[PDB]
Amino acid sequence: DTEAPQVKSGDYVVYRGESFEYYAEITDNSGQVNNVVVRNVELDKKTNMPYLTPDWLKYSTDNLGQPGNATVENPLRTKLYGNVPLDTVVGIYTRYIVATDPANNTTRMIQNPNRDGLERFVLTVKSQNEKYDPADPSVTYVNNLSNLSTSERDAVAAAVRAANPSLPSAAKITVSQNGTVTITYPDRSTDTIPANRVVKDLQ
Ligand SMILES: [Ca+2]
Ligand SMILES: [Ca+2]
Numbered sequence: 367d368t369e370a371p372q373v374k375s376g377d378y379v380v381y382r383g384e385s386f387e388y389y390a391e392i393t394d395n396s397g398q399v400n401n402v403v404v405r406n407v408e409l410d411k412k413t414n415m416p417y418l419t420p421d422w423l424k425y426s427t428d429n430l431g432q433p434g435n436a437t438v439e440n441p442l443r444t445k446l447y448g449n450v451p452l453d454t455v456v457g458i459y460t461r462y463i464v465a466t467d468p469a470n471n472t473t474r475m476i477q478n479p480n481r482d483g484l485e486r487f488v489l490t491v492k493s494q495n496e497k498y499d500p501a502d503p504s505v506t507y508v509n510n511l512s513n514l515s516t517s518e519r520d521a522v523a524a525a526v527r528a529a530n531p532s533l534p535s536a537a538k539i540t541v542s543q544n545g546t547v548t549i550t551y552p553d554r555s556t557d558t559i560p561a562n563r564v565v566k567d568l569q
Contacts, residue, residue: 369395370473371465373485381497382553385449391441394467399436401466402427402444407475422448452553459489493555502563503529511567
């Protein structure tokens with residue numbers, strides 16, 4: 367056996383403050399894979415060993431080291447998962463999935479976008495606001511569209527929550543002097559709802 371295992375992955379998106387779960391598929395001409403490693407291409411400048419960042423990106427593979435566990439008909443599944451911290455940066459990470467067969471052939475890491483979705487994958491970390499699309503609330507009637515009272519602002523905030531049960535429980539809903547709504551997600555990103563869908567002049 368001189369053929370390394372092959373990997374089929376994809377483009378993975380995750381969101382701060384949210385959990386994620388993706389599955390990559392691994393095959394080998396022998397039908398058996400003994401190890402799968404998800405890793406940065408470069409070695410940890412300290413231990414001289416492979417590592418994986420971000421530290422919140424985890425992986426696990428069931429049924430390693432068993433005959434017939436990685437056939438083209440029934441590929442081996444590696445789970446990539448985690449909970450994205452609220453405080454991590456938003457950005458892209460390009461990482462590699464490398465598997466080893468009984469002959470100790472291991473998938474090669476090739477730094478080329480033409481390998482994206484195979485053994486190389488791009489993990490996009492977006493802000494939490496990008497997971498949600500706030501819905502307009504039932505309008506609140508106000509005396510003056512240019513100068514909302516405290517109680518009118520409170521009522522708008524409640525109306526926005528009532529119409530958006532899917533929003534993170536810890537999101538903060540604030541309302542400006544003209545009825546503009548800001549939804550501040552736990553990761554501090556924001557969405558806005560324009561006043562003209564939220565408030566109406568009483569008269
Ligand atoms: Ca092989
Ligand atoms: Ca949004």
